Design an enzyme around this catalytic site. Structure first.
Site, PDB file in Angstrom:
ATOM      1  N   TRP A  64       1.656 -10.940   0.685  1.00 31.31           N
ATOM      2  CA  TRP A  64       2.169 -10.085   1.781  1.00 31.31           C
ATOM      3  C   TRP A  64       1.278 -10.198   3.058  1.00 31.31           C
ATOM      4  CZ3 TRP A  64       2.697  -8.613  -3.425  1.00 31.31           C
ATOM      5  CH2 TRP A  64       3.977  -8.208  -3.845  1.00 31.31           C
ATOM      6  N   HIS A  93       6.284  -3.179   1.831  1.00 30.30           N
ATOM      7  CA  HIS A  93       7.465  -3.134   0.973  1.00 30.30           C
ATOM      8  C   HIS A  93       7.641  -1.653   0.751  1.00 30.30           C
ATOM      9  CE1 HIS A  93       4.236  -3.614  -2.424  1.00 30.30           C
ATOM     10  NE2 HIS A  93       3.956  -2.644  -1.573  1.00 30.30           N
ATOM     11  N   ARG A 119       6.593  -7.042   7.813  1.00 25.33           N
ATOM     12  CA  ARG A 119       5.853  -8.229   7.377  1.00 25.33           C
ATOM     13  C   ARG A 119       5.570  -9.155   8.580  1.00 25.33           C
ATOM     14  NH1 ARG A 119       8.304  -9.772   1.495  1.00 25.33           N
ATOM     15  NH2 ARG A 119       7.879  -7.577   0.922  1.00 25.33           N
ATOM     16  N   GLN A 133      14.477  -2.666   2.788  1.00 29.14           N
ATOM     17  CA  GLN A 133      14.571  -2.919   1.386  1.00 29.14           C
ATOM     18  C   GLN A 133      15.079  -1.655   0.708  1.00 29.14           C
ATOM     19  OE1 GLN A 133      10.633  -3.881  -0.120  1.00 29.14           O
ATOM     20  NE2 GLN A 133      10.665  -5.990   0.200  1.00 29.14           N
ATOM     21  N   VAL A 176       4.429  -4.752 -12.165  1.00 35.45           N
ATOM     22  CA  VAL A 176       5.325  -4.681 -13.297  1.00 35.45           C
ATOM     23  C   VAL A 176       5.020  -5.854 -14.283  1.00 35.45           C
ATOM     24  CG1 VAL A 176       7.077  -3.496 -11.911  1.00 35.45           C
ATOM     25  CG2 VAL A 176       7.107  -6.001 -12.099  1.00 35.45           C
ATOM     26  N   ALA A 229      11.427  -0.549 -12.404  1.00 34.63           N
ATOM     27  CA  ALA A 229      11.619  -0.403 -10.981  1.00 34.63           C
ATOM     28  C   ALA A 229      12.087  -1.749 -10.549  1.00 34.63           C
ATOM     29  CB  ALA A 229      10.304  -0.063 -10.288  1.00 34.63           C
TER      30      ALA A 229
END
Ligand SMILES: Nc1ncnc2c1ncn2[C@@H]1O[C@H](COP(=O)(O)OC[C@@H](N)Cc2ccccc2)[C@@H](O)[C@H]1O
Ligand SMILES: Nc1ncnc2c1ncn2[C@@H]1O[C@H](COP(=O)(O)OC[C@@H](N)Cc2ccccc2)[C@@H](O)[C@H]1O
Ligand SMILES: [Mg+2]
Ligand SMILES: [Mg+2]
Lengths: 265, 346, 214, 265
Positions: A64, A93, A119, A133, A176, A229
């Protein structure tokens, strides 16, 4: 009288395509029992990176390209209306909201989070610096991946289909494990569309949440619960849906373009 | 097969990963593995069902609130617009406003090095570039976005420009400030919020045509004509604006039975200095009308030859009603005075 | 305990009810029983989860369509109104329109003995009674309802009246037909539909000022 | 200039309270995955009474005081766009839609049905002849009463609560065994409110559905599936919610009343 004549020039309003797409995506998830909530565009390095298993000096912090901020007297509020510290930035994000929410609430729950993110990449026709998003988070005891898979499938059906289907490929994200990138089957155009990423919430994120909660005096709430998620690009989708070609078109305040979506609903 | 050593008899095992695997530390990292090897496609489809913990109950309210609003506007006639959250530090000057409290350490461009403190500068700026590309006769639009001052705030601003509304072929138009206000008033009428404006000095707003906004009982945002100096610093003609802070407060409705007994009607005018604001006028008349004043409107006014060079006239239509019974004239021409008395007794 | 005879060893039993129980015929009637005796409150709370059969997919579309519309109107400036679905056969005359194809066999009143074929007669009629109760200077409103002709139909009508819009104090007004059209055009502008009017003769409409909608 | 002056008299629209309440009730169930669909106000004796286990000459046909119709050339459409026969009437409740839907679709599913219904009683302040109801039906294999109980509970929470709760008492309806009448806990006003009726769909109704389906050439779809349905009074609820006192107020096209709900949302 001549009735075929024009009436009193009255203003006809319209809505921005992103708002439109947002609304549609939301109505969809609302039907699966998800609730829509929003976060702040200016975040703390803590919620944007630290909270989510993202390291300072390692390859992860390097996926990022961030916008760092400066200025004083600016008050950043925490999940509980407390002042928080950290280098200021523009949320990279929407994920940070995963944390602000979990800190402020108790499982089980389902939320979806629309949001303008920022970004530092160069703006082409499929990529921008300012885009939106939609994040989704479902936490509860017993949650499994099949649920994340089901969730996404219901989304495809709802968007195209029922002759449409879902594609889940393993991918890596610090927050995740298992991670996954997912594509949807567009029966019409006949191609696979890479929509976003998702996975099962990382243990370290749950840890972070409780740790900050106790720091604030709250009892731990995420010990022994599970969750998934996901997050997807809204412009990338609005474009495919409403048939737009240049992603740059969205932030180009041209009326001739904007009005084209007047009656989208 | 992946090169892990698996000791133990079950149900919980001792698994030592090969050293070339640095990504394998937790039990979950191990699970992601069985997954990808077995194949993500081999994971079935399911849907969860549970009663959400209580503290999640009202959550959606704010979001929804904003949306009903966003929606009402587009329906009232406003074209929605999306503007970058950035700001050219320079415009802090071009538009008479304080400087941005937040700056970028890595601006995309020195013209997007600050964070918008206001929404309207951007709208106006959009106005211009549209004119240059396509030449719209008129334009009415709005935008909702996050501005950055001490704290992050959700603002709402709207801009009007053009000839206005009326018959296209037929000559007249009806536009300008009082048109933008017209819509505004209607919008709150639709939101169930009592709004009013009072003249206020605004650095970026042409004075005289400047005013602060009072949503139900409160001060938030402003409304007015764009100060001409700026109007001209930009190849732009006249523009009309307003910018508020959300969320708007809300008045929970208290339903109230309307009475069947016909109202008491009245014809009345007030002569007060040319400078006096309509405000205090309506205010007084209203606050003295008494408790049975059903309606209060203004059907006319003009400076007026037949009266004091420095005073004006005011056409006020009045209505009264009593719920349980009809209003006895004794109380009408009586209360009427209650007003005229302290009316210019003041 | 309820006086049933229960034979059989299980899992499915032979249960013969007492004769005074005429409500007990099916196995479900039997279940309602265990329920009420055990107590309805003793039944737990749960939520079902399943993927709806495919043919249920788009279902909501029409309903939603109507609502976005209903909504847009109120936002454009129309006050919504609800009118009885009945009709006074007599108005078929009062308002130059054909007669109601459906009549009641048990009308509530000879003035509500037919089924509305049109929506506007009712709006207009509402207009009047409002004037008589409170005296509104102007009024703009709409209503969506089911009218009954050969087939049941969903109609939408709107009525405008008054001085119109403009400056309250300032003299001029801008209203009348071309005002109602103004709004209409805007509405479609908002719906993304291309609309126009052409003069047409309508029994209930003053001619010259009459027109069909496209 | 005098800015405190009134602007251009522009029309401010509003929405009818019933529409408002309808919308709220709908949004609520939408979140549990229910879909909103509508039926016809003019029905056939078949769908209104026969389809649902309601007899001609017995005490059941005698709980609903019906409005019978007459007139020719009127075309009544069936679930599949076919012409149906039966003495015409004004739907006495929304239940008929339970059947039109089940005939035209395949389980599992969740639907909710708003609708203006008609009854011949004398109009007082808590009772009318023209009112609206909202019907709900969920059919699928495995459906049980606890689901109907859950459903209703989520409704109370959503309306009042979470300090609110649900009351289920057995009652009789020809189309559902077990039958039940239900009340909700209003923590505010502090009283129990009898909202509507519900139960587990009656076997004879499923039977009727398939029987008519085969008559139309479709295969049977409701053999071996279960289901619950319920129906509630909308005015009865709008009144309690928006604080209205006279049910007669709804159909009284008085503006002073109507406008009172302008900003309900
Ligand atoms: N420069 C850009 N312009 C427009 N859209 C972009 C973009 N960069 C990414 N996107 C879109 O935004 C989506 C999210 O960005 P990405 O960095 O891929 O994922 C980031 C996480 N927020 C998604 C996630 C959430 C939860 C669990 C796992 C993953 C992408 O799927 C992509 O479609
Ligand atoms: N005259 C009237 N005016 C206004 N509301 C009325 C009314 N008569 C009944 N209602 C309301 O409308 C609701 C439905 O009418 P009721 O005849 O009680 O039920 C009739 C079924 N449609 C409900 C049901 C569906 C599915 C399974 C079981 C039951 C009642 O709960 C009541 O609150
Ligand atoms: Mg791994
Ligand atoms: Mg029984």
């Amino acid at each position: 009288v001549d009735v075929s004549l024009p009436g009193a020039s009255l203003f006809s309003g319209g809505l921005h395509p992103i708002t439109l797409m947002e609304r549609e995506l939301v109505e969809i998830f609302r039907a699966l029992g998800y609730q829509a909530v929003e976060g702040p565009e200016v975040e703390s390095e803590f919620f944007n990176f630290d909270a989510l298993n993202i390291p300072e000096h390692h390859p992860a912090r390097d996926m990022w390209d961030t916008f760092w901020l400066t200025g004083e007297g600016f008050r950043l509020e925490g999940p509980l209306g407390e002042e928080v510290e950290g280098r200021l930035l523009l949320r990279t994000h929407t994920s940070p909201m995963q944390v602000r929410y979990m800190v402020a609430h108790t499982p089980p729950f389902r939320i979806v989070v629309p949001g303008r993110v920022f970004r530092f990449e160069q703006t082409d026709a499929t990529h921008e610096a300012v885009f939106h998003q939609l994040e989704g988070l479902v936490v509860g005891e017993g949650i499994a991946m099949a649920h994340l898979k089901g969730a996404i499938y219901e989304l495809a059906q709802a968007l195209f289909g029922p002759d449409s289907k879902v594609r889940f490929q393993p991918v890596y994200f610090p927050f995740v494990e298992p991670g996954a990138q997912f594509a949807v089957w567009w029966p019409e155009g006949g191609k696979w569309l890479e929509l976003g990423g998702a996975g099962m919430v990382h243990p370290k994120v749950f840890q972070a949440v409780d740790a900050y909660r106790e720091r604030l005096g709250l009892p731990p709430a995420y010990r022994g619960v599970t969750g998934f998620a996901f997050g997807l690009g809204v412009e990338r989708l609005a474009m495919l849906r409403y048939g737009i070609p240049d992603i740059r078109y969205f932030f180009g305040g041209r009326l001739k373009f904007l009005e084209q979506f007047k009656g989208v609903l | 097969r992946l090169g892990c050593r698996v000791e133990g008899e079950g149900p919980t095992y001792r698994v030592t990963p090969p050293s070339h695997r640095l990504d394998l530390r937790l039990e979950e990292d191990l699970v992601e593995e069985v997954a990808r090897i077995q194949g993500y496609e081999t994971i079935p489809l399911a849907l969860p069902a549970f009663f959400p913990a209580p503290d999640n109950r009202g959550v959606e309210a704010p979001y929804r609130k904003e949306q009903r609003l966003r929606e009402v506007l587009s329906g009232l006639g406003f074209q929605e617009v999306y503007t970058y959250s950035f700001m050219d530090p320079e415009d802090a000057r071009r538009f008479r406003l304080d400087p941005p409290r937040l700056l970028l350490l890595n601006p995309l461009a020195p013209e997007k090095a600050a964070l918008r403190t206001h929404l309207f500068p951007g709208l106006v700026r959009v106005l211009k570039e549209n004119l240059d590309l396509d030449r719209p006769e008129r334009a009415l639009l709005f935008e909702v976005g996050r501005v950055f001052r001490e704290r992050e705030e959700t603002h709402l601003a709207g801009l009007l420009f053009g000839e206005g509304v009326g018959l296209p072929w037929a000559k007249e138009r009806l536009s300008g400030y009082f048109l933008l206000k017209g819509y505004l008033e209607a919008l709150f009428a639709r939101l169930g919020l009592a709004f009013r404006v009072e003249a206020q000095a605004f650095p970026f707003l042409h004075p005289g045509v400047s005013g602060r906004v009072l949503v139900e009982g409160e001060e938030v945002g402003f409304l007015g004509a764009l100060h001409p100096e700026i109007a001209q610093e930009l190849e732009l003609p006249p523009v009309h604006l307003f910018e508020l802070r959300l969320p708007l407060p809300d008045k929970p409705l208290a339903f109230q039975d309307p009475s069947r007994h016909p109202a008491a009607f009245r014809d009345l005018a007030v002569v007060v200095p040319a400078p006096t604001p309509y405000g205090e006028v309506e205010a007084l008349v209203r606050e003295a009308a008494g408790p049975y004043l059903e309606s209060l409107a203004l059907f006319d006014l003009y400076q007026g030859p037949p009266l004091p060079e420095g005073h004006k006239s005011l056409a006020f239509h009045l209505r009264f009603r009593h719920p349980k019974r009809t209003l006895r004239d004794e109380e009408v021409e009586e209360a009427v005075s209650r007003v005229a008395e302290a009316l210019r007794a003041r």
